[PDB]
Amino acid sequence: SLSAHEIRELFLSFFEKKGHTRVKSAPLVPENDPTLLFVNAGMVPFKNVFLGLEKRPYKRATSCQKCLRVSGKHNDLEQVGYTSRHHTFFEMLGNFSFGDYFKKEAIEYAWEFVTEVLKLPKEKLYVSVYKDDEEAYRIWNEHIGIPSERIWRLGEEDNFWQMGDVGPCGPSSEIYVDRGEEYEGDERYLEIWNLVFMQYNRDENGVLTPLPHPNIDTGMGLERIASVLQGKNSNFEIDIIFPLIQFGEEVSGKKYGEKFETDVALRVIADHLRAITFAISDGVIPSNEGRGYVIRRILRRAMRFGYKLGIENPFLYKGVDLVVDIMKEPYPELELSREFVKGIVKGEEKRFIKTLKAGMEYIQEVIQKALEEGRKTLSGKEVFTAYDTYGFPVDLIDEIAREKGLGIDLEGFQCELEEQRERARKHPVYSHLKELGKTSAFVGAAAL
């Protein structure tokens, strides 16, 4: 079965036995990358090295990166708690090559650790490569020995990894594992590995040129693989995250595995406790602007979902001093910042619990008053008041309102934002007058 920690230690120790160095985990917040607040994948910290701007003592490197996908293209937040595979904070395993070994090595190195090291079967796996990849389809099939009857040929929406609209990109082949006829889909076959082969130079357009020094970039969400091995149909029912579901049940009063929405709030608390703690640990300080507003929304959401469960008083602060034991083996520095994170998180609670309440009775009444008269959405003025008088993120409102069935009209919200701002000029975070609604969903009202 192997624990989540053993899987990691082994992984990181496997590629060393092949030359790859062990690059310590980089902080989720790139010291000098005003580009992307939080890191999303293992490659992010090595982006320059790949291109070839940052030198490097080695030519190979493995790791387990901390990641937060609470934003944009890689933004699983919207669904967090509504499934069993989506997370804000997650760990990504992998190995990297810089103009060194390519397809073959990456393909073999990832074929051994799966069939001869983790002990996972070899007949219940399905590999996928670039369609016309007579180069990659041949490797998997011939040398590797994967039966041709388990190799699909997909398109870009399935196998064309690009660093950006213009950059190092190439053919990406994934590895799937079957999980019983009962279920099916992407839940029966779990893509527990993505091996990306940086082959071309995508210029300002789509004109691709080969690279006399192709790169490698693979990824494997720990939580995902550390589930199939354990035999759980939920990434949350694993040792490293399960006790967290047991943190809500204890504090709340409900159980896991009875009601849908009840099971949703529970997964939210477990998911957002790991996020805020790892964040606040890497220096992030909650604020009414960007980054500090991100953790604020991840924290605020946890305070709202919990409340639903009936947890009248703060309860997350009793979580941070818990994520430590469940994650101190790999990230020891989580014990030094402990107390610091505990007070930071307890602040957003004491300094933020009752407003969420007085802000909830509001949303239920404005919704009931609306859906009574058949009004499909709440005016932009009915959303603004929650955003200002109660500091409700333009995201949290859109959620609770979706639970009844009424959404929120943005256009109106937009006008309301203008009339207000306009008011000030007649009657830090800096927006545009058209990106008010757009921007306001990323900061607070005391930021506009």
CATH of the domain at 20: 3.30.930.10
CA 65, CA 95: separation in Å to the nearest integer? 11
Is the C-alpha dihedral spanning 376, 380, 381, 385 positive or negative? positive
Burial class (CB in 10 A: 0-12, 13-18, 19+), 142: exposed
| Three-state DSSP class for residue 367 | helix
Is residue 164 located within the same domain as residue 18? yes
Is residue 210 located within the same domain as residue 76? yes
Is residue 242 located within the same domain as residue 177? no
CA 215, CA 235: separation in Å to the nearest integer? 30
Query: Is residue 177 a contact partner of residue 231, using CB atoms and an 8 Å limit?
Result: no
Please name every residue paired with 175 in a beta bridge, in sequence order, or none if there are none.
Answer: 127, 193
Is residue 154 located within the same domain as residue 280? no
C-alpha dist (Å) from residue 219 to 35, 49, 194: 21, 17, 5
Q: Measured in whole angstroms, how far is the alpha carbon of residue 306 from the centre of its chain?
A: 21
Return the residue matching tokens 């579901």. Answer: 245
Is residue 201 located within the same domain as residue 301? no
Q: DSSP letter at 27?
A: P
Q: DSSP letter at 144?
A: I
Q: Where are the beta strands (DSSP E) in 99-221?
A: 125-130, 151-154, 160-162, 168-177, 190-202, 208-221
Q: Measured in whole angstroms, how far is the alpha carbon of residue 157 from the centre of its chain?
A: 19
Is residue 285 located within the same domain as residue 181? no
Q: Considering only CA atoms, which of 63, 65, 66 is closest in space to residue 16?
A: 63
Enclosing domain of residue 18: 1-233
The total number of structural domains in the chain stands at 2
The resolution, in Å, is 2.5
Please report, as a single letter, which amino acid is at residue 286: P
Is residue 187 located within the same domain as residue 269? no
Please name every residue paired with 169 in a beta bridge, in sequence order, or none if there are none.
Answer: 162, 200
CA 175, CA 115: separation in Å to the nearest integer? 12
Among 211, 233, 255, the domain-final residue is 233
For 374, the token pair is 């058949």
Is the C-alpha dihedral spanning 316, 321, 322, 328 positive or negative? positive
Is residue 369 located within the same domain as residue 415? yes
C-alpha dist (Å) from residue 54 to 50, 58, 108, 392: 8, 12, 27, 42
Is residue 211 located within the same domain as residue 76? yes
Query: Is residue 179 a contact partner of residue 63, using CB atoms and an 8 Å limit?
Result: no
Maximum Cα–Cα distance for the chain, whole Å? 75
CA 423, CA 344: separation in Å to the nearest integer? 35
Query: Is residue 417 a contact partner of residue 448, using CB atoms and an 8 Å limit?
Result: yes
Q: Measured in whole angstroms, how far is the alpha carbon of residue 294 from the centre of its chain?
A: 13
Write 320-325 long-range contacts (CB < 8 A, 24+): 320/273, 320/276, 320/277, 320/280, 320/345, 322/243, 322/244, 322/247, 322/273, 323/244, 323/273, 323/274, 323/277, 323/278, 324/277
CA 152, CA 361: separation in Å to the nearest integer? 52
Cα angle vertex 367, ends 78, 439, to 5°?
A: 40
Q: Under 8 Å CB-to-CB from 43, ≥6 apart: which residues?
A: 50, 94, 96, 217, 219
Segment (H or E) for 278: helix 260-281
DSSP3 helix / strand / coil % (the chain, rounded to 5)? 45, 20, 35
Among 233, 254, 282, the domain-final residue is 233
φ/ψ of 168, rounded to 5, equals: -60, 120
C-alpha dist (Å) from residue 127 to 139, 351, 379, 385: 11, 51, 49, 52
Q: Measured in whole angstroms, how far is the alpha carbon of residue 84 from the centre of its chain?
A: 13
| Three-state DSSP class for residue 399 | helix
Burial class (CB in 10 A: 0-12, 13-18, 19+), 348: buried
CA 162, CA 196: separation in Å to the nearest integer? 9
For 240, the token pair is 């490293």
CA 78, CA 232: separation in Å to the nearest integer? 24
Query: Is residue 113 a contact partner of residue 125, using CB atoms and an 8 Å limit?
Result: no
Write 112-115 long-range contacts (CB < 8 A, 24+): 113/11, 113/14, 114/175, 114/193
Among 178, 212, 233, the domain-final residue is 233
C-alpha dist (Å) from residue 91 to 64, 388, 406: 6, 35, 36
CA 321, CA 326: separation in Å to the nearest integer? 10
CA 282, CA 261: separation in Å to the nearest integer? 32
What experimental approach yielded this model?
X-ray
CA 12, CA 389: separation in Å to the nearest integer? 49
Is residue 252 located within the same domain as residue 169? no
Is the C-alpha dihedral spanning 352, 353, 359, 364 positive or negative? positive
Is residue 185 located within the same domain as residue 295? no
Is residue 63 located within the same domain as residue 192? yes
Q: Under 8 Å CB-to-CB from 181, ≥6 apart: which residues?
A: 188
